[PDB]
Amino acid sequence: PELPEVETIRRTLLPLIVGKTIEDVRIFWPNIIRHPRDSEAFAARMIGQTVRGLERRGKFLKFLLDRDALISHLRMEGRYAVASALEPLEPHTHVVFCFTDGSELRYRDVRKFGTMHVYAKEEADRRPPLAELGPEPLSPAFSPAVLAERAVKTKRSVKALLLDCTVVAGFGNIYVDESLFRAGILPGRPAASLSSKEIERLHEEMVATIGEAVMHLYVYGRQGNPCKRCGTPIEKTVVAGRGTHYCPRCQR
Template identity: 40%
Template sequence: MPELPEVETTRRKIEPLLRGRTILHVEHDAPHKYRDTHLAVGRRVTGLSRRGKYLMLNLAPQEAEEGPHDLEFIVHLGMTGGFRLEGGRHTRVTIRTDGGDLFFDDPRRFGKMAVVRPGEYAGMPTLAAMGPEPLSEDFREEGFAALAAQAGAVKPWLLSQKPVSGVGNIYADESLWQAGLHPAQSHLTREEAVRLYAAVRDVMGRAVEAGGSSLGSGAGNYRQHDGLSGLFQHSHAVYGRGGEPCPRCGTTIEKTVLAQRGTHHCPQCQPLRRPEGRAKGGRA
């Protein structure tokens, strides 16, 4: 599933293809999945932005319009969505512009699009409640630690997108391993939250640099839009490595299920701390 680094890589790749272009037509046959896309027709794309795992094409007002009527063309890639330069068997949406066509392929059809007034996300509760971007200055250690002290199991809390946006299953597992925290740990101490804050920023930053992760055909099929694979999967310490030795201590990495998500952790490096604050296992 594309996570923040993959979506950011997609944004960087397709922005040069769309910026300054006028949308001539948006073709699809699923108006309940791709809502109000007709509103984009005749509008120029002024840029591409991103919030968490959502891409936004920023659309200028039409020339004949009075007053400010910017719109946002929101794209969620879902499990398997991605943009291509040529149409194919799994093309669901074709965006025709005065500079050429762009094709949205989505084999499993979980992707969604909608054209809305900027900031009007009432139909998209996850987007409306989304926390700060992990690599932005809005993501602050103090605020994160205060929220973490109140939170339940830390991994589902990270995946909620509320404390910080864009952290999905892969990067949650990697960040928790780096911070030495058990995925089910609740009510983080300040010191634990500070470690996790630093780990999230580091992991997300490295993943964006590497162009995201690409997974084998069984687990998903994210590819950059030009067909190149992201490289970050070569840096995974625990994700997808159940039964292999932990790169830090050599203990066998466990794969479990937490809140319906496959979860990987090292029982030695990431012990579950008892409520009294004393760790089980070897870490003092």
Template identity: 40%
Template sequence: MPELPEVETVRRSLLPVVLNKPIITVQVNYERILQHISSADFKSALIGNEFSQIKRSGKYLIFSLKDNRELVIHLRMTGRLTYYSDQSIPLAKHTSVIFGFETGDELRFEDVRKFATIDLVSKGNYEQVKGLFNLGIEPLSKEFSPEVLSDFVHKRSTKIKSVLLNQSLIAGLGNIYVDESLFMSGIHPERPANSLKKAEITRLHGAIQTVLKDAIDNQGTTLRDYRTGYGQEGSFQNRLQIYGRKGEKCPTCGTNIEHKKVAGRTSHFCPICQKE
């Protein structure tokens, strides 16, 4: 599933090419992608409208419309929002929605697994989008401090990986970047959250922000499905230290990297550098 760096990369790549262009056609090939609205009403709301801004909140993309409504998009497992400069370019097999612009270009929403969603809401009215409505703090925001992270972990005895994956606490972190952050900070994913000492929390906070910024700079991680808004692969997969490297040598100490299920997800760690 695309995580914060991938969604942010899609946002940044689409900003220069889809804003302030009249939408003249909307084609819905998979109606179940639309939440709480029919295909006919969706088309009626979008045709003649324009995207005026794109924001990101956690793993959600929020497209502002000129009529003061918003499209809330979640890519889920395999969703792709891809810009095409020419409407004559053949459609990908699993294209769910197409937004055609007056300028002759298109924004296409492709989704192999068909889990992605689109909500049309009044500006800021996110009650119907449960995950967004209950979303936690942005980990790259000024508000996300070591003190805030300390408050999260010291109130909970669950495994630290479970806390970091909790979207109602910290928005946008997923399996890849939690594993990478825990490795960088030398913390085992199964450590009880409230066992972390102040210095460890400070290291973890710094690791989270460093890993996320580095991943964004490298346009995210492409392991299989993810692509930028231009249809290109990210490159952070080439910089992963621990995630997906089971059986390989730890880049720090040379011990074999191990993996196990933690918080319902396959977790990668070094048993020496990240002692339980």
């Protein structure tokens, strides 16, 4: 799930788990658990805690419990579901949080690629994976000035910069390509080559693109198809180690 979908999960999951008390934690693929390093300690520490809140930072979900925060990343295919402990588990279920009311929060992921970290709540923001995370794209903390400051001091491409989690939180490959198209900026442009005008326009389109999605694609996955603006075939390359989609006429 991309940031907008992660926000939907945050909003929808919260009422389904708030006020429930963890009775057991069952782990079927311990490598998902990144902190504490021992998955047995991860399970043990969560028992007896009640779910109090659910927040989002970039694409991370932060489950707030009594003493601890659980920080979860679903990557591309991870999913959460609340269901009865009496029913058979779905395939690829790697972690289950069992509540005292006979319901469960289940984590599933065909790719087995997601991560979970648990720390005392007051520690979570200063440890991985939240430590160093950049500002929310929809917050005033993410501004043209902030983007310009990062752009001038790097030799990297503009796409590489937007994909950097320390620059802006959880802006995915899809939104990077869509925002660059909407801004009329080539993904391989050096970040430092962008004018003040271009930085402003890029910030504007990043906010509009992600904001529209939180509340329909021009280029992403559309290689070989006509640009919706000018009819030129969309092209695909590799930029910053990612599949990269752009209109060679409209982007400069």
